[PDB]
């Protein structure tokens, strides 16, 4: 294990380190412009030394050719001595450029890192997803075809669950439902509860009142809200799960309002009972 | 403002300008240093020096801070009667002037007067380094509330 | 599992003891046991004794180094002390092991100073290993199903292997729930092979939804630090986007497909909160506690890249004018906030704004496209800020700059002031509003002389009117914004403006000492065209001063105060003045 490589990462634009008496934006500007002018200065220096090295190498090739052609020839002892002195001097400044080259090469590892050095792009790809239309809805036919399957696939499950009102089970089952259920069989199940009220099932009747009041509230809130009810349950769940004594008593008085509505629906029920039967 | 600029320069940071418009007086009395557009034409002839293309140094910043704070205490502009940029720069070439001494406040504090007088004697290169200036500021401040 | 999988792709005939791969969980609240059988590679007695019985060493590193130098696998685990964290909540563990070429063995310890191994006979295991535990008495809470499901969802659900559950609920069945992980990762394989629909599918399984997204970006980057992105954009603006409080978990972060941490006060700026995604990578300087990343500068480098390569998508999507309508109506708050607080990328963001102008009845107009059609002599764009669309649609100031065929825009929203306050330029131009210290527009020469004649002829009425009005207004002049109304009110450059005068009062948590200083001084503007102002002149040179002039001037001034959206402090004073004449309307007061 060695983290000595991940220890000199710096940015031109840090936020946590700042001063109470300094402008943050102008400080970003100063840091970035300093960092870029510094890279460009070191750049200029590095192509300067690179072209110095290139001309040094071309002169090395030239002097190698000169030495070869002097070896081919003979009798130029003075010229040979002069070019030997020149070659020794060239070798001396060659160690000069070499020691500074190795110094800068070594200090390259000491240079702090940055984003444009660590990263090189390899891929990218976008998309839009503007698929044609969502739906167009009639008023007559769809009310049956999806309705029947919504009835059989959920009436028994809602009968099974509706026997309880404990909060987290109710919340998660209703989350499943609003992920999957619709409205027609919801209302129609409510009216089955209404016409089954005869058995006087007190806990069942309270939970029936709860489910019908929440579905009615969700539907009116969604309609005035112009949003799909199936995606409108979270704020209700967080409001009713932390419903305190005042909020529960508001629920109780609105339930009393629903209770005179219960008396009204029962009266119309009994009247239709005599009329039909 | 001295504490702020000391902190900024503590990271080897140059400013290249601190023109008196670059200050925002925020809530209460708090300085925010600006960059975008008293000593806007009063810098040292170091600017006019165009040799080796790097005359920039901390000395110009120190002198500019000194003159700017002195004028800000003073409250009015030096050199507003005679204005000839070409003739001013020619006179800078030879026959450069000296600051006027009559233009001084009556209640100039002794420590600050001594510091500003001592700043520039022969060369604008042996200026002191920031935190002892800060110490002089703090001692003069916490040495004359009333007692 | 991965070890044996890679080993298999050398000689597939060696797997003649079991032909599949699976992971299983066995709770048992009778002897209080937590059997955790898997089907990994196995272990031999010698490696067991000389490797497991020693603190702080990984055999994985030695095995990986033994495997050539450079291969094709990305494995996890390099520290070694991971099994010794199993005693945090435990009292006694036993490991049951067997290798294909070894015998059955069991290892036992109880956090003491010694351990035991022993050969055993019983149920035959093919190649897997068992870990069995005795749970503490005080922590008998992790055994039920809901906590286990919650924790497995939270931490590790992306391993592409079948972890399964065998609980027992109500003739009674053996629950074989396999769906613990059934949403394989999508940023791994070749990006081209994916067929659209799972981009719609994966987003739903990401956060519990039944809608679809609006865009996607899937870039990946190599080099030294390597990672991949799976950013999305939601179709519907959440009601609770600003509810905060609950810890923010919009953007996650994985290292080798294992959850580490999540936070978006360093990964992305606050005004881009609505974006989700996966930022998986390969290797980072992690902690011994495998949740924190030391050397926190990395979490600052990643931010630059993420914002840079999201802004490109944002700029690109400005082509289709249909989708841009539904996007701009929903998340405009984010861009309008972001333009306020950012410095590196401001000019680039100065074109994604759409406004309503006075040439487009019910269509938004781009300001960049606005740069096309202006007149030649004109300088700088003209704009107004109001409280309501219709309220500003027909304003008294406009009635002069509208007759000349120019073009203006309406920024009528509280944040619009915040945006327009900071930005002051667009492509060499300036942004100036109508109510800033008497703007003037270049125009024909002959109007100059008559206007200055009104200046030089109406000096006395302008002189004597300031006496009767005490120190409320600064100056009254004749300018060019009035053709159908006598009077109006305009602010000053160094000071506040009318609409933010109400954004500040309406702001809840603020001091009450700030009003003293930066209230903007006020300016009144008169129109020497309405006959009322001329009718004032005859009584001005006729009567030096009396009650009637005071009454009329205070009435007109107080009415003018309402004209610019200012709210009076004593409505009874003006209500009495309006009721004073309706009684003359029917005649006899008394
Ligand atoms: N299920 C297992 N089957 C066989 N050998 C195992 C098993 N788990 C651990 N070992 C062995 O015992 C060692 C204990 O190390 P452990 O796996 O707990 O840590 P690690 O993977 O190196 O680190 P970390 O848990 O931080 O990723 C392993 O390196 C491996 O040699």
Coordinates of N, CA and C and ligand atoms in Angstrom, one line a residue, chain C residues 3 38 41-43 47 51-52 57-61 76-84 129 131 288 290, ligand 1:
Chain C
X3 N -13.4 -15.8 -7.7 CA -12.2 -16.6 -7.8 C -12.5 -17.9 -8.5
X38 N -22.9 -20.2 1.1 CA -22.6 -19.8 -0.3 C -22.0 -21.0 -1.0
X41 N -15.3 -21.0 -3.6 CA -14.2 -21.9 -4.0 C -13.9 -23.0 -3.0
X42 N -13.9 -22.6 -1.7 CA -13.5 -23.5 -0.7 C -12.2 -23.1 0.0
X43 N -11.6 -24.0 0.8 CA -10.4 -23.6 1.6 C -9.8 -24.9 2.1
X47 N -3.8 -23.6 4.4 CA -4.1 -22.2 4.2 C -5.0 -21.7 5.3
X51 N -3.3 -18.8 7.4 CA -3.8 -17.6 6.9 C -4.9 -17.0 7.7
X52 N -6.0 -17.7 8.0 CA -7.1 -17.2 8.7 C -6.6 -16.9 10.2
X57 N -3.8 -9.7 7.2 CA -3.2 -10.1 5.9 C -4.2 -10.7 5.0
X58 N -4.1 -10.3 3.7 CA -5.0 -10.8 2.7 C -4.3 -11.8 1.8
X59 N -4.9 -13.0 1.6 CA -4.4 -14.0 0.7 C -4.8 -13.6 -0.7
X60 N -5.8 -12.7 -0.9 CA -6.2 -12.3 -2.2 C -5.1 -11.6 -2.9
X61 N -4.3 -10.8 -2.3 CA -3.2 -10.1 -2.9 C -2.1 -11.1 -3.4
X76 N -12.3 -7.2 -5.6 CA -12.5 -6.3 -4.5 C -11.9 -7.0 -3.2
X77 N -11.3 -6.2 -2.4 CA -10.7 -6.7 -1.1 C -9.2 -6.7 -1.1
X78 N -8.6 -5.8 -0.3 CA -7.2 -5.8 -0.2 C -6.6 -5.6 1.3
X79 N -7.5 -5.4 2.2 CA -7.1 -5.1 3.6 C -6.8 -6.3 4.4
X80 N -7.8 -7.2 4.5 CA -7.6 -8.5 5.1 C -8.4 -8.7 6.4
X81 N -8.6 -7.7 7.2 CA -9.3 -7.8 8.5 C -10.8 -7.4 8.1
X82 N -11.5 -8.3 7.6 CA -12.9 -8.1 7.4 C -13.8 -9.1 8.1
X83 N -13.3 -10.3 8.3 CA -14.0 -11.3 9.0 C -14.0 -11.1 10.5
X84 N -12.9 -10.3 11.0 CA -12.8 -10.0 12.4 C -13.7 -8.8 12.8
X129 N -19.1 -23.2 1.4 CA -18.7 -23.0 2.8 C -19.8 -22.4 3.6
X131 N -21.1 -20.4 7.2 CA -20.8 -19.6 8.4 C -22.0 -19.6 9.3
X288 N -9.9 2.6 6.2 CA -10.0 1.4 6.8 C -11.5 1.1 7.2
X290 N -14.7 1.4 5.6 CA -14.9 1.5 4.2 C -16.2 2.3 3.9
Ligands
LIG1 N1 -15.7 -16.8 2.3 C1 -14.4 -17.1 2.3 N2 -14.0 -18.3 1.7 C2 -12.7 -18.5 1.7 N3 -11.7 -17.8 2.2 C3 -12.1 -16.6 2.7 C4 -13.4 -16.2 2.8 N4 -13.5 -15.0 3.4 C5 -12.3 -14.7 3.6 N5 -11.4 -15.6 3.2 C6 -9.9 -15.6 3.4 O1 -9.6 -15.0 4.6 C7 -9.0 -13.7 4.4 C8 -9.7 -12.7 5.2 O2 -9.8 -11.4 4.6 P1 -11.1 -10.6 4.3 O3 -11.7 -11.2 3.0 O4 -12.0 -10.6 5.5 O5 -10.6 -9.2 3.9 P2 -10.3 -8.4 2.6 O6 -11.3 -8.9 1.5 O7 -8.9 -8.5 2.2 O8 -10.7 -6.9 3.0 P3 -12.0 -6.0 3.0 O9 -13.1 -6.8 3.8 O10 -11.7 -4.7 3.7 O11 -12.4 -5.8 1.6 C9 -9.2 -13.4 2.9 O12 -8.1 -12.6 2.4 C10 -9.2 -14.8 2.3 O13 -7.9 -15.3 2.1

